Amino acid sequence: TNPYARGPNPTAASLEASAGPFTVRSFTVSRPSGYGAGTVYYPTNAGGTVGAIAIVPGYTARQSSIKWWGPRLASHGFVVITIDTNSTLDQPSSRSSQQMAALRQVASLNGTSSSPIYGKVDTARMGVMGWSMGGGGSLISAANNPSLKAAAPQAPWDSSTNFSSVTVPTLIFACENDSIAPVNSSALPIYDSMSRNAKQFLEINGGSHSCANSGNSNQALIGKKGVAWMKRFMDNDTRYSTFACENPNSTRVSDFRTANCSLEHHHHH
Template identity: 30%
Template structure:
């Protein structure tokens, strides 16, 4: 807990001067003061507001918390859905709401219908939430359904990858934290990762205890890495392996500056389409990261990292 507090204090400081977004644009404000070679340094320039979608508001999903910028300009906002993992609740991913909203996104951090839901069921709920947001009188003017990103931890990460392979509406980009990966755990989640069609980032952690439970894959992080390897073709993809920590598989439920930096950069680059975030994604390995692999054919990276 002390470590988490230190990390939060180091990255998530209160925003300073608030920059105004460009009129009529759905993109976040072009303010490079929020970015340096080490990635996002703090919350972004947008002030945020919060609403709640109650359980039962829509039969397709279980509700959650909505965060979005207060500014009236810049609407509709690119929209991110965040799904928790097996046996976890919305609170385990709630810190992504205010973080991503401060960079110009509307964010729904979700409950799953039951804590036991499979990745496929969780993805169905994310798809239902997109439809709800696009039709609801409370959100339809705020949501850009042409700029959707999906994020998840553990089973929620599998759900995001499932969306990237099969679902309609297809997200523009996904981020999966410690996905359990059908390739690693030898379970059939009906997610053909070789069919992933959008930019996908996977962030794992060294010696992930839940991945080491299978005898066949007793080597560091063998959950996120097999998922990364299984994504083929010319699709942009990136694997970031965090250094070992006491939180282990649960590193992603508390604010973490490395996780925040890569998540913000990936979603802004590929959901909002802002090339000024190429610098960080093409950059070196920051402290707290054990390994990076990437295949980024659409980015002008000078030195490509190992693909496999």
Template identity: 45%
Template sequence: MRIRNKIAAAMAAAVAFAMLGSGVVPTDAVAGQDESYQRGPDPTMASIEAERGPFAVTEISVARGNGFGGGTLHFPNDTSQGTFGAVAVAPGFGESELFLRWFGPRLASQGFVVLTVETNSVFDFPSARADQLLAALKFMVEQSRAKDRIDTSRLAVMGISMGGGGTLEAAVRNPALKAAIPIVPWNIGGGYAGIRTPTLVIAGEGDIIAPTPIHAKAFYDSLAPGLNKGYVEIAGGGHIAPALPNVTTAKYSISWLKRFVDNDTRYEQFLCPIPKDPKTSAFLGNCPHS
């Protein structure tokens, strides 16, 4: 059984890589979605709350081009456990990649290849940021120094504010994405019933720039009822707090990525039953399912 699974996974990765090379995103039919890709030791609450995970990480600068404005690539040094999922992260309106660079080592040290993206313009709207998130993923698997470390069938997107709106739009365009995490997302006229990607929306209770009733919560409510989805609202948080280095955003982002990018059920314990976290003013969702 293990040999058959490994052969199937190798064939899936080869087909998915070829499809990405032709500009097509791999579909669930070739994604090996039933296989678990455990990386690292058994998790604990302490391990997902820690500033760094078990993997030592390399960081390198990425130049402007290839459809986005450059950024910083973060990847685990150890490849003895196999390839990793890849995550592209976009900033918000008027923000530099420096604002969200903390996600890079925090996520990469847990076993992901991460590109914190500089946008072509700090004034780009969500649609353009979606384009750039997808371009960043394409660059990661085709050209980056970490390309040989990436499983091309296990890709995810994250973003802050308009980058969060771009995250949702990217998930609409690419249903093969394994996870989407929009943080304090901002967009206009967005309904996301068509998203098929497991989506975790992170909001701030006191957000007045992207008020939760018409942005984060409305976007969450628009997601299909049967979708793997979650909504975390940080108590007392405004528009900026959930995007700054903090344990709450980090630990649930890590758990979501591990569960859906790596299909690692060891992390379900941090998502189900729905946590009663004093750092949150609301926590909604369903228990993860296949």
């Protein structure tokens, strides 16, 4: 009865694996419109149109830092675009604009007959992710475009931590030992500012500022939570309500918080 549900019934093991159920292909965007470069990852056999996610790196950084999210998320039934910004030194507001330009072009390619993603995207269902200033930009995107279905930035930073207006379901990945954007000055005040949304705070035990980037040692836990969050809120898929909203009870997590995360038959502890 859910028109957006895709793929098999999830398990902890199926979500911790590096590869989800769907075959993934990818291509380079030949003329980026409003951003520097992009790679689009897509499932060939998702069983219907899927939502789209745009992911942005941090200051000085490039697609390599965020690339692993492409195959991880696309294999569970999403079209994912990872971008390079017009300049590696762009600030969060510009990163937000370029993130939204990448989503716009994914929608354009969905209607372009020659494109590998022709007709593969539900353009009414989109999400935003990104690292550090690109995570700040993701929250700016969410604040300015409340029809976005989900946000999941990692080690986010912005010159202001006040995202009180955000109504988009937002998962904040935090890195416990972040010295660039320390948790108590960045990720946690950002999380605490949001009182109008479903939200979650997931702090990775012992993580440096790059703890959610390509090659990290927690792709099982981080990927499981990212996929479950995007599935629950971009697809309204309540098969993922538990994976999305529950404390994962992992030795790799040093701090877990969540609010307005709908769970039937939840305990009271």
